[PDB]
Amino acid sequence: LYEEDYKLALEAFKKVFNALTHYGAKQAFRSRARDLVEEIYNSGFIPTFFYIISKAELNSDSLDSLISLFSSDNAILRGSDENVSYSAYLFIILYYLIKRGIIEQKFLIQALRCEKTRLDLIDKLYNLAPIISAKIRTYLLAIKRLSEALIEAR
């Protein structure tokens, strides 16, 4: 009928394809995409989310880049290859969580701004893990397909 998850994946890959300026960051985000959907299927969402935020290094420098990618289109993720790969994938997940109204965008953005409320963000995510893991499947699979299509390998 709708396949709105594919539309959302498309309009999110639109963004993250225009923030990873350096090409290696694109190739590494593709690596993250081809793997984290399998990991989230097997080992649930909360463990994979912890593994993503850990490898992302969400220092306040990056967090500003994400909060800007939310609204702006001239945002650019800054960092190393893998750091921005995991930051882009975290943004993918958070975009889905916002657009589908699972989280309030005001609350999320206010959390990423502060160094403490990020813990409350992770907590509220923990309380919603089953619904999130049931919903985000098609979105993440679409993102995986887009990544392996529109990006050359290494």
Partner: protein, 285 residues
Amino acid sequence: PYYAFAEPFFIHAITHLHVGSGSSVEEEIALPFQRDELGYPTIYASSLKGAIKSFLLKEFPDKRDVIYKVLGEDENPEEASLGTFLDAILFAIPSRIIEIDSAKPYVWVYVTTYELLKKVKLYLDSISQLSNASFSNLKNKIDTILAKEGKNITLDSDLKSAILNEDFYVELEALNNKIPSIINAGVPLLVLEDSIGREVINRSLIRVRRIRIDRDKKVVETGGLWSEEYVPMKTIFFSVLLGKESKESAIFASCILRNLRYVILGGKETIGKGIVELRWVKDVI
């Protein structure tokens, strides 16, 4: 009545078991396991019938016509097969356990839900109303359980608390020691609420990544990477074998269904998957 004989049986997985479901594009597991109308794994009666009928057909080369009469010819067919399988309902699945409120140690138990027992009760009702072969024993062993729906419950021991598959916490309330255990197996058998049983059973499957290595340089081939999905050994499925008149059918349920204990279901039977033990409820309760 309609059915001359009715042979309900269990399917215990000796090794791991993989009954292929058929791939797709939005699958996230290259080779999935046959699910049923509510997510839980089952064995479609087509796979059951084909596997068994292919087993009997070579383990009984003398009476290769009683089989063809009860389970249908493979050449030109001129009559409906007299035998009728049924989709193997998942009965009980093993699961790792880290228990509370008991020093009595178990490293794994059996887990089933109420919806699975309701489907089994459906099978039993229909078969007892369609073959005259009633199963008051098993039917009451299941009615006693279903009288306790909406509340986790343990049968073969007293636990009162446990953590199943490292994630899920349950507060079991032993039904009564007065219930004779369904298939013994030593270990306890939990009957869980279904909303939690769903996650537990899903977590209790066995997903496994496999690769394919180039045959001249010991390195993976491109595209040679997938995942498979087994149910663990000691899994119990419950099916029913149904039969009609034409005394070839009567032979079948006296010469064939007694020498039938071990078969190979599903695929990957070169990876030692699928070895199965059938245990007829006729002589197991």
